[PDB]
């Protein structure tokens, strides 16, 4: 149990525990009334009014095990409806950040601790952040351009936020989970909801592309497979709740993740297609059918590589001509009309197979002439009309073991009108790397001609994108959203 | 707060030949009533104006049926020998009946006891007789004398036009709904000619060759026509003067073809063609005359017909077979003081200032499994899952949701042999299925790892495990042969 | 529908006309809290399980009470209810309560500003009616007494200052089938108070019964006689009594029968004398089915079966 | 050309640093139930309770004192521990707000209009051990502070009075208890109850609960969890 | 109309109005420049206000009542300050004031002159040849308050010092309602239930003009130099005459007309409009009592106008917390699928005794009953001889039909498992020559891939199965 709050009379006891329920006990006949579904467990309850008119209650939102996501709620006692709800943006970090501590329960789970487990986990997290170098915390964040709406892929959910007024406008579940259909108890807390790992839009803005992974329960016969689900949705500008139209189970077959997703631009099919890429190197191009309201596997290039490395990415030429494919130690160029390599009859050594030193993280074209690639040890800026290298910079002394693959892809972005903007993270240390972080956001242009501007920030920054007003948006570890702009 | 989310039914990936809304509509065409006649029924045609009726030719007889009752409404039996054609007018009042004596008999519907007009064509028996569509008062007949004759009602004793230019056995002719003057005619030589009634006539404007004997011609659109004859059928366009497409997907000689357009259906335009097998088939010109549906009646069908677009009720489809069989496939559609003490409830608030409603609609009633999984009676939900009267996919769904929400151990804790056995009965019914085998494997694995020695102490459950081993080795062989066939597919690609 | 009118002699205009959807309105009362004097709620209910509270300018604030914190098994509906004040008497805090009838004997009490289930009182037999008497105790304190009345004729007096305890019983003399009880003469529902010090103990108590009979008692002698005799036994109506209401100053008692048209009788008190000059034969009433008095101005509003409300004035006040 | 500016803030500044109190909802309703006031991690937002939207924003970066006190770029130590409706200085001004942070600051400001960029800044005395709680009956204020010397924290209760001088915040030093495990305060603000391990030293059971009145000495009662508990547990 | 009486202040910034409320008249003052919850109730129900005048150092109003005494009421303090009591049990039919001088006509045909600064009745007075009187003004002769006008259906110019009737214009038939002096020697008389404002000339004793409205004239107001006269009309309208004192020329119609209509279609009547130079103010009743106002420029406004207001006529109650259907605002919307399509990533799209002639016939006309009856057999020699003597592309579509039948009824695939083997065996090379293998056997490859996916977990099941089976067999 987490909250106990008496009424002003002393005849009613408001109780709140791990299951997402608020129990009003009438102490005379020892009866009760319930609030069973609240989108999160409740830490605190309190009565406010002089006659006891409002119930205030603070919720934990512990589904995000990395970020303890709070929510303030205020109810009329009359109808027991949500009179007022206040909540900030809820990112999904790769690890717990500073002091985030799982609340008290009976069993130490993936979402809770025991008491000896509380002290041990506090010591363990502190020693983890002091010892390790893998502090990434890179969260996926998407931006809907047709409304400039901030989209947060919460764990088995989406939080639609608008930073102009700094308010959460929507919260929507997408997976067939038990987030709201049922609370969770001491032994069910080891069960976890499906993880919606990837979420983007098309340039039309009317099609929402999703990819989640399902986790079967432990200690079973089929506790091994990670069922990969893709979905396409649609919402209007007069609505705010997306509607699913196409479901897809197991793209490219069973148990193979489809980690890299890239939408289509409006130039080829009015941005109604997508490209899905695995560790195997297969590229599947799906497209929305005309006569059928669903999408279809229009194109497919299917290699079958015996090795596996998820350090995969792809970029797309602005006219839809060719596809860059960043693979571990390899750069591929793919024709779009046949899903073959870029066969040039003139043979001017603008080949479709480039060797690189380490695993490629990002490959981004700023136009039809300049391509910047960020591999796990360095960055290289090259031309496309000519196969001549221009720029190169080291990523080794800072990006040493900080991230896994794909995190640089979700980090660095590129604007079509001003150039590229990247990120670096450091920490101030006093004799042990101290917890306090310090990042730098650097603005370049035209395949790193010069630094347009370097700007250090006194704390951590986990995500950077650009709003379509041509202004770049960065996050903090705290849910604070800032902008660099003209 | 929020509401309780409804249970998400598990939708499998699509099987081949997924159920189209077109297939849903043609399967909403249910309720096939079968009616006998004496001889081979020849021609069926609906009534245009009020589409609640249709006429059918039969042995020396013309029978008019209603649609809402599907019963013999009118009987025309003034004939001598067997009739050949029956066709209504556009005004829905006169039907013309081509007989086998070379005199056509046209008279009003709903009054069999008057022969309003007895027009005499050539002494050879007449084959087909048709009203005009745009014109109210012109008729066209065609006989065994290989001469088609255009008749006006004012001149019953002499044909107004005598159209010729044919080769052998004129048996179909039709009009175009766009031009009220052009007429198409199909003889036994293929070669549908296109004539004009406002010109001289006896020489066609132009013809288009159907080599096998064409037995039906239908102006499907203002620009396209269909030649339904022989085994195949060729859909031509008059403006390009050329066959746009052709379909030869029919088994026997096609015996009838009709068209219906702009009506209450997912498919806007439907083209039915029946081909002497009971086999009637529905295409659509919107999809370049692609196969969409098909019905099969046993006896070789002779005539099919569809209710028109303005049917304003139950749609109908009939297929008279050569044994004389009509197939009606119908897609169907307190005192004064008490009132004065409660007479205000019908107000509905049209005039007052502020309207307000917080009402909730009545959702679908939950089933036993949904109620029990909501109330967490998990073992009882398992029992209601393995009741006998329960669908396979529905038991699959509740198995999936129990395994996903809770754990199968708490699902299977307090079991005995009598509640273990319906689970395993459902297993022996459904391990053979492709969609469920992994889930059933999870469930049988956890129940064996729980109930190891109770398996020994209970004897018949051992026999269940024996026959389970036999059938699962059958699936072993099936799946291994399947991987073999996949290997030989990899060879052949 | 709810229609709030501004009332005059020449123009009785609409101020507001709300239309609830799918909920009949059997009873609807105003309410203003004695502590704040600015709340101005409107409560309303019918034969449903929800009770609409409209707060008191173009959007309506309609909350509704539907959940019973103890038990939804005591009552089928909300169709008869009343509003009262109550002092907490440990903290000197007054708030509104809502009294409701139940299945057999259950009287349910809800803290009104929040919808709480406060207390419950069960009489024996079947409830036919109840009323809310006030008793001032000291300067700044009172206690409310719920007077419930069975069908057969008993009367139970509970107090609600402390939790529900029967102060007393007594049986109405005669009175086989009682329909409506109503106290009067002091501060009550039809004549509410505006502060604590204005609360006065009611003087008269009327009991109306479906044999057309009305027994009228004086509180000052019923409370000490403990099986009292009625000061009067009025009988001028021949059908069931449906409305017993006192004047705002305790001088007139109107009794109205819903069954037959023109069934209103006014009785002057303490003389227990039926007024003779009114209503006459040529008095437009129809089937009278709701009566109301003005709090001050001596107006008398009478609403009938045909939807018409009419409005007289007593020129003495 | 390219300027940086934080725009949106999230997290409510919940008093996680307390971690002992079960009344951690610091956001309070006004006198008139019209607007609700929440201090975030970076700002203070006031919402009208009817239209449900943020009618006023109080950005620490937009303020000068709040930037120099709360937006310290080196330590996140100072977090708001309580809002108070009435002004501490003047008796019955209406639209005032008194703010107490983690370290003894008394910031008197105004909502309902334009915030003046010179709020009444004060600092309490005896700010060595950290401020944990504060509350009041009429007139007198009580202040609880976490004091440190077995990974537990002693509590020193003082009475805070004012209006002798503008800086003179008089501390009365009411009482003190040691190594409190779990403490809580009634909704009236007149009673608190806490625990200890001194009876774990003096006995076999590990804690005993003591309830203490604040502005009076009516209820001062201690009793053991051994007396509370049962043999089955 | 609910409003009984109303009157503006000079400059048109506040208006006072007395209305009945529960048979007690209450007066209330509202500012009209952009509520005032204050009122003044009358203690008795029988006494009522009759005349109501504004006075500008504390601003106040003057209430001639039924009592026979004049109530001077200060609006800011919200208290009746003084009662000038007249020596009669009668009713003040008309009041008037200029500076300190006050005059009233009482229903006993009695004139009374009062002084405010003296707080004193200066003089009671009565006169012959005035049988009824219900309106009076004093002429704006500067500081001299002589030669005042009285009116009840016959206007009489009567002096004060001479104290006798001087001039007598023919008035109307009904009693005079409004009587207002615009300029020197020109003044308006308007009766009750009339449509004709007579603009009378004083010194000639004659009629300058008549002004005609469209219906009964309720209230009159005029600007500073007669260039604008706005009258509110009893059906509810505002008729303004612009420059009515200049030259079929005896009667002048209204120059402009202003109605007020709501957005739904209902018409809101008007009462007591006031007009300044190039600025007009209109008043109406929003709720049953609440007065709402509007300001507008009658020069730019055309000759016919209808001011529209948005009254909440059939408004639906939108609330903040409640979503447009069913759920609330903070209710995080759940996940539903509906009729959405599920598709795997392996279904590719947009990428002797034989039975031979019956197979080819079914495949030329895909009869499903005939296909069932021709796939019912299982004799392997007949299978081999069929797909020996079958056509290649017909065997291809036969493989497609085999795939869809297996996928529809996986229980049927038992005897049908060797059929595909024989098709590939006897027509493999045609499948080498066809270009789109995936496009022509996507369904076969999907079913076979599903079976190969079911294989290994099934074998794990077999290991656990015979493990526990031999376990209970030995024990």
Swiss-Prot record, chain A:
The keyword Cell cycle does not apply. Keywords: Nucleus, Repeat, Ribonucleoprotein, Ribosome biogenesis, rRNA processing, Transcription, WD repeat. One of its GO terms (biological process) is maturation of SSU-rRNA. GO terms for cellular component: 90S preribosome; nucleolus; nucleoplasm; peroxisome; rDNA heterochromatin; small-subunit processome; t-UTP complex. Transmembrane segments: none annotated. It is found in: Nucleus, Nucleolus. WD repeats lie at residues 1-35, 191-243, 253-296, 306-346. Its main location: nucleus. The keyword Nucleus applies. GO terms for molecular function: mRNA binding; RNA binding; U3 snoRNA binding. Involved in nucleolar processing of pre-18S ribosomal RNA. Required for optimal pre-ribosomal RNA transcription by RNA polymerase I together with a subset of U3 proteins required for transcription (t-UTPs). Present with 6560 molecules/cell in log phase SD medium. Interacts with snoRNA U3. Interacts with MPP10. Component of the ribosomal small subunit (SSU) processome composed of at least 40 protein subunits and snoRNA U3. In the absence of snoRNA3, forms a complex with other t-UTPs. This complex can associate with pre-18S ribosomal RNAs. This is NET1-associated nuclear protein 1. It comes from Saccharomyces cerevisiae (strain ATCC 204508 / S288c) (Baker's yeast). The chain holds residues 300 to 788 of 896 of the full protein.
Swiss-Prot record, chain B:
SUPFAM superfamilies: WD40 repeat-like (SSF50978). It is found in: Nucleus, Nucleolus. Its main location: nucleus. WD repeats lie at residues 36-77, 78-117, 123-161, 165-205, 209-246, 249-293. Keywords: Nucleus, Repeat, Ribonucleoprotein, Ribosome biogenesis, rRNA processing, Transcription, WD repeat. One of its GO terms (biological process) is rRNA processing. Pfam families: UTP15_C (PF09384), WD40 (PF00400). GO terms for molecular function: U3 snoRNA binding. One of its GO terms (cellular component) is 90S preribosome. Present with 358 molecules/cell in log phase SD medium. Interacts with snoRNA U3. Interacts with MPP10. Component of the ribosomal small subunit (SSU) processome composed of at least 40 protein subunits and snoRNA U3. In the absence of snoRNA3, forms a complex with other t-UTPs. This complex can associate with pre-18S ribosomal RNAs. Involved in nucleolar processing of pre-18S ribosomal RNA. Required for optimal pre-ribosomal RNA transcription by RNA polymerase I together with a subset of U3 proteins required for transcription (t-UTPs). PANTHER family: U3 SMALL NUCLEOLAR RNA-ASSOCIATED PROTEIN 15 HOMOLOG, UTP15 U3 SMALL NUCLEOLAR RNA-ASSOCIATED PROTEIN 15 FAMILY MEMBER. This is U3 small nucleolar RNA-associated protein 15. It comes from Saccharomyces cerevisiae (strain ATCC 204508 / S288c). The lineage of its organism: Eukaryota, Fungi, Dikarya, Ascomycota, Saccharomycotina. The gene is UTP15.
Swiss-Prot record, chain C:
Involved in nucleolar processing of pre-18S ribosomal RNA and ribosome assembly. Keywords: Nucleus, Phosphoprotein, Repeat, Ribonucleoprotein, Ribosome biogenesis, rRNA processing, WD repeat. This is U3 small nucleolar RNA-associated protein 18. It is found in: Nucleus, Nucleolus. It comes from Saccharomyces cerevisiae (strain ATCC 204508 / S288c). The keyword rRNA processing applies. It comes from the Eukaryota. Its main location: nucleus. WD repeats lie at residues 20-57, 186-227, 236-277, 283-316. GO terms for biological process: endonucleolytic cleavage in 5'-ETS of tricistronic rRNA transcript (SSU-rRNA, 5.8S rRNA, LSU-rRNA); endonucleolytic cleavage in ITS1 to separate SSU-rRNA from 5.8S rRNA and LSU-rRNA from tricistronic rRNA transcript (SSU-rRNA, 5.8S rRNA, LSU-rRNA); endonucleolytic cleavage to generate mature 5'-end of SSU-rRNA from (SSU-rRNA, 5.8S rRNA, LSU-rRNA); maturation of SSU-rRNA; RNA fragment catabolic process. The chain holds residues 271 to 594 of 594 of the full protein.
From Swiss-Prot, chain E:
GO terms for biological process: maturation of SSU-rRNA; maturation of SSU-rRNA from tricistronic rRNA transcript (SSU-rRNA, 5.8S rRNA, LSU-rRNA); positive regulation of transcription by RNA polymerase I. SUPFAM superfamilies: WD40 repeat-like (SSF50978). InterPro entries: SSU_processome_Utp12, U3_snoRNA-assoc_WDR, WD40/YVTN_repeat-like_dom_sf, WD40_repeat_dom_sf. It comes from the Eukaryota. Transmembrane segments: none annotated. Involved in nucleolar processing of pre-18S ribosomal RNA. Required for optimal pre-ribosomal RNA transcription by RNA polymerase I together with a subset of U3 proteins required for transcription (t-UTPs). This is U3 small nucleolar RNA-associated protein 5.
């Amino acid at each position: 149990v987490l909250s106990l709050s008496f009424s002003h009379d002393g005849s009613y006891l408001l109780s709140g525990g791990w299951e997402k329920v608020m129990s009003l006990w009438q102490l005379e006949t020892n009866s009760q009334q319930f609030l069973p579904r609240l989108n999160g467990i409740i830490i605190d309850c309190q009565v406010l009014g002089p006659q006891g008119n409002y119930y205030s209650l603070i919720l934990q939102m512990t589904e995000n095990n990395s970020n303890s996501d709070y929510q303030f709620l205020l109810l009329n006692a009359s109808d027991l409806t949500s009179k007022l709800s206040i909540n900030g943006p809820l990112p999904v970090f790769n690890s717990t950040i500073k002091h985030i501590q799982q609340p008290i329960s009976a069993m130490n789970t993936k979402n809770s601790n025991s008491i000896t487990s509380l002290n041990h986990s506090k010591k363990k997290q502190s020693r983890k952040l002091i010892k390790s170098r893998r502090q990434d915390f890179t969260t996926n964040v998407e931006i809907n351009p047709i409304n400039k709406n901030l989209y947060f892929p919460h764990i088995s959910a989406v939080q639609i936020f608008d930073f102009y007024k700094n308010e959460q406008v929507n919260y929507q579940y997408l997976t067939s989970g038990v987030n709201n259909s049922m609370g969770k108890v001491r032994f069910e807390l080891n069960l976890q909801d499906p993880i919606i790992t990837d979420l983007k839009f098309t340039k039309d803005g009317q099609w929402m592309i999703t990819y989640e992974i399902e986790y079967p329960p432990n200690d079973l016969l089929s506790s091994k497979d990670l069922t990969h689900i893709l979905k396409f949705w649609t919402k209007n500008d007069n609505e705010t709740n997306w509607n699913l139209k196409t479901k897809v189970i197991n793209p490219h077959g069973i148990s193979v993740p489809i980690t890299k997703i890239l939408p289509s631009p409006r130039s080829v099919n009015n941005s109604q297609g997508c490209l899905t890429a695995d560790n195997n190197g297969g590229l599947k191009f799906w497209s929305f059918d005309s006569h059928e309201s669903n999408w279809c596997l229009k194109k497919i290039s299917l290699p079958n590589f015996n090795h596996f490395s998820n350090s995969v990415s792809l970029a797309w030429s602005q006219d839809g001509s060719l596809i860059f494919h960043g693979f571990d130690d390899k750069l591929q160029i793919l024709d779009f009309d046949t899903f073959k390599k870029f066969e040039s009859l003139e043979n001017t050594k603008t080949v479709s197979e480039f060797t690189l030193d380490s695993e490629i993280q990002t490959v981004k074209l700023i136009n039809d002439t300049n391509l910047i690639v960020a591999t796990r040890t360095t960055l290289n800026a090259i031309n496309l009309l000519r196969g001549q290298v221009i720029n190169s910079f080291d990523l080794y002394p800072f990006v040493n073991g900080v991230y896994k693959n794909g995190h640089m892809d979700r980090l660095i972005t590129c604007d079509e009108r001003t150039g590229n903007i990247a990120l670096v993270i450091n920490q101030q240390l006093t004799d042990v790397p101290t917890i306090n972080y310090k990042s730098r956001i650097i603005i370049f242009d035209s395949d790193l001609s010069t630094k347009l501007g370097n700007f250090t920030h006194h704390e951590y920054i986990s995500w950077i994108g650009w709003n379509y007003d041509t202004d770049f948006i960065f996050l903090d570890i705290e849910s604070t959203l800032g902008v660099v702009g003209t | 707060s929020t509401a309780r989310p409804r249970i998400i039914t598990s939708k499998a990936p699509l099987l081949p030949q997924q159920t189209t809304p077109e297939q849903r509509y043609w399967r909403q065409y249910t309720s096939a009533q079968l009616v006998k006649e004496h001889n081979s029924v020849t021609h069926i045609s609906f009534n245009p104006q009020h589409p609640h009726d249709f006429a059918v030719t039969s042995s020396t007889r013309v029978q008019i049926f209603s649609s809402r009752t599907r019963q013999v409404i009118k009987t025309f039996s003034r004939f001598k020998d067997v009739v050949y054609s029956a066709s209504f007018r556009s005004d829905g009042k006169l039907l013309c009946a081509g007989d086998a004596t070379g005199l056509v008999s046209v008279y009003d519907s709903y009054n069999p006891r008057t022969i309003l007009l007895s027009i005499n064509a050539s002494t050879h028996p007449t084959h087909v007789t048709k009203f005009h569509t745009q014109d109210n008062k012109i008729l066209a007949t065609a006989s065994d004398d290989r001469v088609t004759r255009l008749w006006d009602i004012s001149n019953a004793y002499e044909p107004q036009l005598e159209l010729t230019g044919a080769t052998d056995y004129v048996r179909t002719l039709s009009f175009i709904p766009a031009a009220p003057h052009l007429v198409a005619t199909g003889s036994y030589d293929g070669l549908i000619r296109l004539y004009d009634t406002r010109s001289s006539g006896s020489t066609p404007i132009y013809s288009l060759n159907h080599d096998q004997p064409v037995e039906n011609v239908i102006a499907v659109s203002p620009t396209q026509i269909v030649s339904c004859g022989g085994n195949n059928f060729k859909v031509w366009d008059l403006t390009s003067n050329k066959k746009l497409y052709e379909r030869g997907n029919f088994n026997k000689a096609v015996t009838c073809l009709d068209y219906v357009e702009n009506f209450d259906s997912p498919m806007q335009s439907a083209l039915i063609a029946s081909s002497l097998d009971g086999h009637v088939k529905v295409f659509d010109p919107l999809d370049n005359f692609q196969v969409k549906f098909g019905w099969k009646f046993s006896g070789p069908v002779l005539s099919c017909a569809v209710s028109p677009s303005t049917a304003q009720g139950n749609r109908h489809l009939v297929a008279g077979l050569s044994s004389g069989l009509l197939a009606i496939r119908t897609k169907k559609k307190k005192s004064n003081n008490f009132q004065r003490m409660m007479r205000g409830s019908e107000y509905q608030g049209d005039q007052e200032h502020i309207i307000h409603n917080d009402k909730v609609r009545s959702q679908r009633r939950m089933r036993a499994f949904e109620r029990n999984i909501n109330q967490f009676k998990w073992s009882e939900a398992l029992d209601n899952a393995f009741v006998p009267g329960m669908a396979k996919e529905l038991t699959l769904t509740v198995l999936q949701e129990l395994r996903k929400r809770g754990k199968v151990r708490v699902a299977l804790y307090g079991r005995d042999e009598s509640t273990l056995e319906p689970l395993l009965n459902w297993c022996l019914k459904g391990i053979e299925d492709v969609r469920s085998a992994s889930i059933v494997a999870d469930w049988v694995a956890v129940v064996l790892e729980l109930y190891g020695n109770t398996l020994e102490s209970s004897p018949v459950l051992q026999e269940l495990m024996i026959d389970l081993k036999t059938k699962v080795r059958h699936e072993i062989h099936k799946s291994k042969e399947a991987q073999r066939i996949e290997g030989m597919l990899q060879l052949l690609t | 529908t709810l229609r709030i009118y501004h009332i005059d002699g020449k123009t009785n205009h609409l101020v507001t006309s709300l239309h609830l959807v799918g909920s009949p309105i059997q009873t609807c009362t105003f309410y203003t809290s004695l502590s704040n004097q600015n709340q101005q709620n409107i409560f309303t209910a019918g034969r449903r399980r929800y009770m609409h509270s409209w707060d008191l300018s173009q959007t309506a604030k309609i909350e509704k009470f539907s959940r019973l914190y103890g038990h939804e098994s005591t009552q089928r509906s909300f169709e008869n209810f009343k509003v009262a004040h109550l002092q907490n008497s440990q903290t000197n805090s007054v708030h509104g309560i809502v009294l409701l009838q139940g299945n057999n004997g259950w009287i349910n009490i809800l803290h009104s500003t929040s919808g709480l289930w406060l207390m419950g009182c069960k009489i024996e037999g079947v409830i036919t009616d109840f009323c809310i008497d006030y008793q001032p105790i000291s300067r700044g304190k009172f206690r409310t007494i719920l007077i419930a009345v069975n069908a057969y004729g008993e009367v139970w007096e509970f107090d609600l200052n402390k939790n529900g305890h029967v102060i007393r019983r007594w049986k109405d003399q005669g009175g086989v089938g009682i329909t409506k009880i109503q106290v009067g003469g002091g501060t009550t529902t039809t004549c509410p108070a505006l502060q604590i010090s204005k609360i006065k103990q009611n003087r008269w108590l009327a009991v109306g019964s479906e044999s057309g009979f009305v027994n009228l008692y004086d509180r000052n002698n019923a409370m000490t006689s403990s099986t009292p005799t009625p000061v009067a036994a009025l009988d001028q109506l021949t059908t069931t009594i449906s409305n017993l209401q006192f004047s705002p100053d305790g001088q007139i008692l109107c009794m109205a029968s819903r069954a037959v048209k023109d069934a209103l009788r006014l009785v002057h008190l303490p003389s227990c004398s039926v007024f003779s000059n009114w209503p006459t034969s040529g008095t437009p009433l129809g089937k009278v089915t709701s009566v109301a008095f003005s709090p001050s101005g001596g107006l008398l509003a009478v609403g009938n079966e045909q939807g018409k409300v009419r409005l007289w004035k007593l020129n003495h006040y | 050309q390219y300027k940086l500016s934080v725009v949106s803030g999230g997290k409510p500044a919940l008093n996680n640093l307390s971690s002992v109190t079960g009344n951690k909802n610091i956001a309070r309703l006004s006198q008139d139930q019209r607007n609700y006031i929440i201090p975030f991690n970076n700002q203070i937002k006031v919402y009208s309770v009817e239209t449900r939207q943020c009618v006023k924003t109080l950005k620490f970066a937009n303020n000068s004192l709040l930037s120099g006190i709360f937006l310290q770029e080196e330590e996140n130590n100072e977090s708001i521990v309580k809002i108070l409706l009435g002004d501490i200085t003047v008796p019955q001004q209406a639209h005032l707000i008194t703010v107490f942070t983690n370290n003894g600051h008394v910031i008197v400001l105004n909502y309902k209009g334009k915030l003046v960029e010179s709020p009444k800044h004060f600092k309490i005395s005896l700010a060595d051990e950290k401020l944990a709680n504060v509350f009041h009956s009429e007139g007198n204020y009580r202040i609880l502070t976490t004091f440190k010397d077995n990974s537990l924290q002693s509590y020193r209760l003082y009475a805070l009075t004012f209006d002798d001088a503008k800086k003179q915040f008089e501390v009365a030093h009411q009482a003190e208890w040691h190594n409190v495990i779990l403490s809580n305060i009634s909704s009236n603000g007149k009673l608190l109850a806490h625990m200890c391990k001194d009876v774990s030293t003096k006995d076999h059971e590990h804690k005993s609960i003591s309830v203490v009145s604040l502005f009076d000495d009516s209820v001062n009662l201690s009793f053991p969890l051994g007396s509370i508990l049962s043999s089955q547990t | 109309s609910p409003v009984l009486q109303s009157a503006y202040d000079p400059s048109g910034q506040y208006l006072c109005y007395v209305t009945v409320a529960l048979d007690k008249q209450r007066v209330g003052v509202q500012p009209t420049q952009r509520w005032n919850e204050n009122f003044l109730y009358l203690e008795d129900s029988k006494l009522k206000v009759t005349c109501l005048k504004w006075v500008n150092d504390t601003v106040a109003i003057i209430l001639g009542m039924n009592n026979g005494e004049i109530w001077l009421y200060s609006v800011l303090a919200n208290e009746v300050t003084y009662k000038f009591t007249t020596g009669n049990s009668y009713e003040i039919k008309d009041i008037d004031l200029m500076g300190n001088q006050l005059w009233c006509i009482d229903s006993s045909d009695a004139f009374y002159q009062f002084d405010l600064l003296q707080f004193k009745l200066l003089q009671h007075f009565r006169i012959n040849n005035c049988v009824q009187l219900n309106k009076l003004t004093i002429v704006p002769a500067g500081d001299s308050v002589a030669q005042l006008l009285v009116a009840s259906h016959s206007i009489s110019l009567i002096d004060i010092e001479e104290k006798k009737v001087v001039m007598t214009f023919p008035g109307h038939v009904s009693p005079v309602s409004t009587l207002q002096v615009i300029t020197n020697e020109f003044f308006i008389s308007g009766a009750e239930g009339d449509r004709f404002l007579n603009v009378y000339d004083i010194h000639s004793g004659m009629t300058k003009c008549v002004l005609v409205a469209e219906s009964d004239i309720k209230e009159l107001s005029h600007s500073g130099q007669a260039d604008s006269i706005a009258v509110t009309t009893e059906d509810g309208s505002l008729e303004i005459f612009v420059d009515p004192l200049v030259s079929g020329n005896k009667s002048k119609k209204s120059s402009k007309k202003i109605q007020i209509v709501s957005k739904d279609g209902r018409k809101v009547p008007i009462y007591n409009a006031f007009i300044n130079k190039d600025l007009l103010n209109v008043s109406w009743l929003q709720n049953a009592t609440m007065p709402y106002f509007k300001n507008l420029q009658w020069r730019e406004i055309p000759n016919e106008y209808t001011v529209e207001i948005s009254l909440n006529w059939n408004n639906k109650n939108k609330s903040a917390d409640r979503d447009l259907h069913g759920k609330d605002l903070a209710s995080a919307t759940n996940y539903v699928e509906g009729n959405a399509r599920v598709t795997s990533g392996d279904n590719f799209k947009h990428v002797t005794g034989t039975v031979t002639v019956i197979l080819s016939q079914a495949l030329q006309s895909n009869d499903h009953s005939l296909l069932e009856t021709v796939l019912n057999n299982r004799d392997e020699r007949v299978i081999r001889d069929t797909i020996f003597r079958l056509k290649p592309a017909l065997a291809v579509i036969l493989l497609e039909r085999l795939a869809e039948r297996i996928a529809r009824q996986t229980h049927r695939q038992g005897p049908l498992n060797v059929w595909v083997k024989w098709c590939l065996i006897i027509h493999g090379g045609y499948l080498v020559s066809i270009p789109n293998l995936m496009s022509t056997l996507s369904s076969l490859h999907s079913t076979l891939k599903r079976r190969s996916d079911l294989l290994p977990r099934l074998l794990a099941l077999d290991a656990r199965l015979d493990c526990t089976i031999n376990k209970f067999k030995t024990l």
